[PDB]
Amino acid sequence: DDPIGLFVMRPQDGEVTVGGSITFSARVAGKPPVVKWFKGKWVDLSSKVGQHLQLHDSYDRASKVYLFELHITDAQPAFTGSYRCEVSTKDKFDCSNFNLTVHE
Amino acid sequence: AALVIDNGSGMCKAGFAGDDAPRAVFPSIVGRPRHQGVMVGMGQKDSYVGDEAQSKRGILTLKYPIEHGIVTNWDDMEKIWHHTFYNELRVAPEEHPVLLTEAPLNPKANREKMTQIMFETFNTPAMYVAIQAVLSLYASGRTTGIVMDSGDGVTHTVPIYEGYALPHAILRLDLAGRDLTDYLMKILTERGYSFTTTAEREIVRDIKEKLCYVALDFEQEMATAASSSSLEKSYELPDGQVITIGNERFRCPEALFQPSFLGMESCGIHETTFNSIMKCDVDIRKDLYANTVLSGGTTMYPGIADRMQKEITALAPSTMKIKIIAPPERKYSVWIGGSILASLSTFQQMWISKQEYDESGPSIVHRKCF
Amino acid sequence: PEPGKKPVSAFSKKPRSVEVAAGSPAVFEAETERAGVKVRWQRGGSDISASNKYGLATEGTRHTLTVREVGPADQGSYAVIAGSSKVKFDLKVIE
Numbered sequence: 001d002d003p004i005g006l007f008v009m010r011p012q013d014g015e016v017t018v019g020g021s022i023t024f025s026a027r028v029a030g031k032p033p034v035v036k037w038f039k040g041k042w043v044d045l046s047s048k049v050g051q052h053l054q055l056h057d058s059y060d061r062a063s064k065v066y067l068f069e070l071h072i073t074d075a076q077p078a079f080t081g082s083y084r085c086e087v088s089t090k091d092k093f094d095c096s097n098f099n100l101t102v103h104e
Numbered sequence: 105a106a107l108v109i110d111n112g113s114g115m116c117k118a119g120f121a122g123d124d125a126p127r128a129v130f131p132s133i134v135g136r137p138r139h140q141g142v143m144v145g146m147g148q149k150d151s152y153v154g155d156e157a158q159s160k161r162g163i164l165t166l167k168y169p170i171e172h173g174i175v176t177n178w179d180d181m182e183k184i185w186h187h188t189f190y191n192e193l194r195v196a197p198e199e200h201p202v203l204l205t206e207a208p209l210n211p212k213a214n215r216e217k218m219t220q221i222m223f224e225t226f227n228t229p230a231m232y233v234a235i236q237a238v239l240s241l242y243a244s245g246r247t248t249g250i251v252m253d254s255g256d257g258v259t260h261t262v263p264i265y266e267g268y269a270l271p272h273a274i275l276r277l278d279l280a281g282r283d284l285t286d287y288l289m290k291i292l293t294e295r296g297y298s299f300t301t302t303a304e305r306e307i308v309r310d311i312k313e314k315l316c317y318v319a320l321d322f323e324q325e326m327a328t329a330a331s332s333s334s335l336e337k338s339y340e341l342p343d344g345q346v347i348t349i350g351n352e353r354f355r356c357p358e359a360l361f362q363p364s365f366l367g368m369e370s371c372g373i374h375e376t377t378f379n380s381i382m383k384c385d386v387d388i389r390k391d392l393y394a395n396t397v398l399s400g401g402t403t404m405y406p407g408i409a410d411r412m413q414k415e416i417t418a419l420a421p422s423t424m425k426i427k428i429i430a431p432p433e434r435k436y437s438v439w440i441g442g443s444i445l446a447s448l449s450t451f452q453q454m455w456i457s458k459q460e461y462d463e464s465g466p467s468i469v470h471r472k473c474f
Numbered sequence: 475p476e477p478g479k480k481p482v483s484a485f486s487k488k489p490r491s492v493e494v495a496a497g498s499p500a501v502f503e504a505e506t507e508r509a510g511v512k513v514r515w516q517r518g519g520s521d522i523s524a525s526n527k528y529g530l531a532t533e534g535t536r537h538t539l540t541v542r543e544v545g546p547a548d549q550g551s552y553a554v555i556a557g558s559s560k561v562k563f564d565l566k567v568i569e
Contacts, residue, residue, distance in 0.1 A: 042465065047217060050179050078225075105523030105530075122525030194532075196512055200523060447526050 005094020006033060008065065011085050018104040021073040026085050026096070030064030037070055038084040045070070045083065052079065075102035106446035107195060108203045109188060110439045111181070112257045113170050113282050114401075117439045118188035120195075121203075121446045126439060128192030130154040131306075134180045135164030153187050161303040168302075173210055173257040178217065182225055189226075197226040201455050203446045205438060206233050207253070208260045209276045216466035223461050230455035233469060237262035239441025240399050244429075250384070250392040252377055254360075255400025255438055256281060259373065261380040265388050269474050273383040277376045278368065279360050281402030285309040287366055288356045295352065311339055316353040318407030322361070326351050357405055361415075374415040381420070393420055394427040399437040403430065484508060484559030486535070489552075493566040494544055502539040502563065506556040509535040513557075518550030 006028040016022040026035070035057065037045035049055060054071035068087070072079065080102055086095040110117035111132065119126025135152035157164055169180035189197055202222060206215065215233055222231045237251040237260060250263035259277035263270055288308050289299050299308055315337055319325040329335055329351030336350040359365045361372045371379070381392050393416065398409060409430035417426040431437075445451055456472055487505035494500040506513060515522035515530065515537075522539065524530035529540040537556075541548070546567055553562040 047213075047220070050177065052179070105525030105528070120524050122528070194512070199512075199514060199521075 003094070005092060006087055006089050007085070007094060007096055010096040011070075011083075011098040013099050014101070016072070016075055016100075016102055018102070019074055021071065022075065022100070024070040024072075024083075024085075024098065024100075026068045026087065028066040028068065028087055028089075030066075031090070032059070033066060033090075034088045035066075035068045036086045036088070038086060039081055041084065052076065072100065075100075077102065106200045106203060106443075107189070107193070107197075108205075108439065108442040108446055109185070110205055110256075110442070111170065111184075112173050112205075112207070113168070113280070114256055116184055116188060117436070118193050119439070119443065120193070121200075121443050123443065124440055126436070126443075128188055130187075130192075131158065132169055132184055133157050133166045134169060134183065135160065135166055137163065138165040139163060151183070153183050154191075158306075164303075166302040173207055174214055175218075178221065182221065185221075185226065197228050200228075201230050201232070201446070201452065202226070202228055203442050204231065204233050205236055205239065205442050207258050207276075208235055208237065208262055208274055210258075215469045219456065219461065219469065220466060223458050228458065230457040232451075232455040233473065234442060234445060235262070235473075236260070236399075236438050236441070238264070239445050240397055240437065242445060243437060243441045244395075244397055246395060248388075248391060249395030249397070250377075250380060251397050252373075252380075253399060253438070254279060254373065254403055255435070259360075259376075259400070261377060263380060263384050263388075263392060270384065271474075273380060275376060275380045275383070277373065278370060279363070279373060279402075281400065283366070284356050284359060284402055285312060287359050288312055291352055291356065295349075297347065307341060311347070311349070312353070312356055313404065315339060315349065316356055316405055318357055318405045318411060319354045320407065320410070322355065322358045325354060357402070357408070360402065361411070374412055374419065377412075377416065378419055390424045393424055396426075396428045398428065398430045399434045401435050403434050482558065484511070484557040485561050488561050489554055489563045491564045491566065493568060495568050496545040497542075498544075500539075500541045500544050500565070502552065502554070504537045504539070504554050504556070504561075506535050506537070508557065511557040513537045514555050515539050516553040516555070517548070518552065522552075 008027040008029050011024045011026050014022050014024060037055065039045055045053060046055060052072065052074060056069045056071060058067040060067065079100060082097065082099050084095055084097050106121035108119055108121055114131060116130055116132040117126050118128035135157035137150055152160060152164055157166065169175050169177055169184060175181050189195055204218060219231060219233065222228060236253045240251050240253060241249065241264065247267060248265055250261065253260045257280055259279045261275045261277065263273050285305065285308060289305060292299060292308060299305060332350040336348050339347045341347065361374065363370055363372055377396065381389055384392060409428045413426055413428050420426060456469065460468065484507055485504065486507040489502045489504040492500065492502065504513065522528050527543045531538040531540065546569065548565060549567040550565070551562055552565050553560065
């Protein structure tokens, strides 16, 4: 099938109500791997961090899996769009596509 | 027409191209309710922007969106920009190109994100980022020389010859009017008066703008300050309390001349101007000294030019006569350069287009302009 | 034949053609049917706004355009758009 990256679990499409919070996550299998989040093909989410968007990373020793989370709060119309999650590893590079929808 | 906005510490200047005086001048501050309020009838208004904040200054915890020419929080800036285009200006971003002014050796993120917000949040066909030293030069009307730019933010020096540039020769100086205000508040504490609040921080700055003046010589007045008759004046606060100052007010502007009071290794403004000239070639040095231009928020006090002229003439070679030009309303001179710069037809072709940003990326700012 | 009735108009009063000598000031008065809307001005070649070489005065629902730069090359057509409605007028130049 398709080539294997370190995302054991790819991010999933999410639905969120007005003024709420939504969490998206990606798992990486086992230095720590670097994770980038994108809006569209060439727009980086990390440079868009503020009240509306937050980034957080967590590590689970038992499964040797790193949990990467994208936090979106008080979501607005302007944030509706396609988001791409890219994870880089010591020997390989991989990416995934997911969408954020906010209405009302 | 065109829109020119000055951004970068303490104040936001908003206006229209074709005017030598902007429509909207207000501080770049955002106020949030420090204390929770338990009352009925208030809209709560959890967000204050502009001069409204100045009136409700005590309860509100003021936060500056821009620190040292760098913006800490991007959405606060958006509110400021929104406020300038819609409330005082009463104009649409769609209608005209927007000009922004930026200091030299400033970090890449400020140019890239600022353009990114203008391209994405405020949709416009094109925008351009200009540098204060070049605009002042055009205002001056000279194509060759060295420009000393000291104002809100960071003091910078940028020599130019016949339009060719010398990046190595450009020097950045960590002095500013805002820095003097911090010095001033620090100096007040020894006298028994303490200001540790952002709200009252402005009040000392207000004092500095009209009460402070430049002495012919710092050391002689300070010496004569032991018995101060006419060196002390009474200032009235909104509070109604009375403040009296003496040698304290004239020693504030002095710090630019003598950074040792601030606690920094770097030499004062006259030594730095000299250093910039030394880097440049001897052949072009001769018109550099006679073409010194002063502009900015902290250059307002009379006599600065007279002190600079004698200090530069003494330290510098006697080969060439030293001429310094410092005209009134120099505080808004940088903004003025921007409004005139946008006016020229040739300049309009030069603006960084939205199409270009999306096709190549934020990294093309350096590529398009020096 | 022409259509029976025009689409909803945003101008209460249509600016009317006026004549001016070269170097003589020119003022065009246009009124909109709705307040709170910004009115753009355009000349037979480029857009017109409150900038050097042009002068715009607006108050409430009244818009005034003043041109001091007007001369022999200003003969042509002036277009003014208030929101959804577009209206144009002819400027005559006297030699």
